[PDB]
Amino acid sequence: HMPHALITLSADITEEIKKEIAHESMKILSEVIGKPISYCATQVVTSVGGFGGKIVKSAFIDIKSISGLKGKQEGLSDRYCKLLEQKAGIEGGNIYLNFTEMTGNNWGYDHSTF
Amino acid sequence: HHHHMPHALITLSADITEEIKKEIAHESMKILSEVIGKPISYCATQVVTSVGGFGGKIVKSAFIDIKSISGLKGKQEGLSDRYCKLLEQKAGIEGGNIYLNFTEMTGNNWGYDHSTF
Amino acid sequence: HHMPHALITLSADITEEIKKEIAHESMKILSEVIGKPISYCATQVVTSVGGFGGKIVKSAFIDIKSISGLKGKQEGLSDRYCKLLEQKAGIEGGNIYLNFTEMTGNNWGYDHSTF
């Protein structure tokens, strides 16, 4: 399935906390999408962010994979919102998520495609 | 009367202050709300500082990823004009060094506050 | 008129100069493999904190987007970027994911307008 999470968040957090978020994100991907964690990936990007016209700690989480998302979107949102709430104090009302299934031909990994 | 949930992820490579980045995020959300037509409480924006190039040269540039649950069809031109005027005014980025993408998402692929749509 | 773009999110500890070199080479790769002139090839290099397989390690995610012109070139594109990131940033091929997306022109904005 090759799940990936690009997490763009604007909290003032330590680098350690960013690493813990990346770690928990890969665990979340494996547990909810159901694949072995060795193929789960995550990048955490620090941003300057706003929600509803206000500058507030917030996030956008871009989930992409070679299928495996259909029906699992709700569970992933609840896990990620609890995580960013727990590690960065970001409110659920200030987090957007996106889920996108990609065909193998448009998925690159280790010099090749699927 | 119809909920659209617009988002703009702005990746730009200008040398600008954090305050100017906040102003960009703020104006971006106003632009989204005014042009896509939704209440601004549902418009969101993240500004990401990058190292960037255009046309083989290293130059002030940006990539603006606009996403929503519909509401984009026909509004892309107006959005391109307002964002290019914004990044030019605040960061000095030329219109010829900004790319934008527009993507309409189905509700089931949109997460918010522990649930989906 | 393909307008290729590469958004490179990588978590290596590299200099700003090296990041410019990656962006510079990225546009050349776009121009050479998609077959277009480089004047419309564009790239952003974004520094992240990243992991692969539950561990924190240098890794990358590469978002390749254009108005078509990708169909069939993805294999070649993955090979060049994986070699580029290995050579300039020491990132292993097994810690790089890539995505390819063809956009219709009406959903492609540039210089105050669309296509």
Q: What is the DSSP string of A9-50?
A: E-----HHHHHHHHHHHHHHHHHHH-S-GGG-EEEEEE-EEE
- Say how many CB pairs under 8 Å bridge B and C: 108
Which are the contacts of C115, defined by CB distance < 8 A and separation ≥ 6?
C1, C3, C67, C105, C106, C108
CB distance C52 to C59 below 8 Å: yes
Tell me which DSSP letter residue A55 carries. Answer: E
Give the closest residue to C74 by CA, choosing from C108, C58, C97.
C97
CA atoms within 13 A on the CB side of A4: 25
The CA distance from C23 to B8, in Å, is: 22
- Residues composing chain B: 117
Q: How far is CA A104 from the centre of its chain?
A: 20
The CA distance from B22 to B114, in Å, is: 26
**Domain locations in chain B as residue ranges:** 1-117
The CA distance from A74 to C73, in Å, is: 34
User: What is the distance in angstroms between the Cα of C55 and the nearest Cα belonging to chain B?
Assistant: 24
Residue A57: φ, ψ to 5°: -60, 130
Using what technique was this structure determined?
Answer: X-ray
C61–A4 C-beta distance less than 8 A: yes
Chains that touch A (3 or more CB pairs under 8 A): B, C
Of C20, C23, C65, the CB nearest to B101: C65
Is A88 in a helix, a strand, or coil? helix
The CA distance from B66 to C105, in Å, is: 14
Sign of CA dihedral C92, A67, A79, A86: positive
The CA distance from A78 to C28, in Å, is: 41
Give Cα separations from A64 to A86, C22, C57 (angstroms). 23, 24, 20
A59 touches chain B (CB under 8 A): yes
Q: What is the DSSP string of C37-78?
A: -GGG-EEEEEE-EEEETTEE---EEEEEEESS--TTTHHHHH
Identity of the residue numbered A101: E
CB distance A26 to A83 below 8 Å: no
Give the closest residue to B12 by CA, choosing from B37, B47, B42.
B47
Quickly tell me which residue has 């026909």 as its tokens: B74
Resolution (A): 2.5
User: Please, what is the Cα angle at B56 between C26 and C50, to 5 degrees?
Assistant: 30
Give the other-Cβ count within 10 Å of A1's Cβ. Answer: 17
User: Please, what is the Cα angle at C9 between B87 and A54, to 5 degrees?
Assistant: 45
The CA distance from A35 to B3, in Å, is: 34
Give Cα separations from B113 to B66, B68, B95, C92 (angstroms). 20, 16, 35, 36
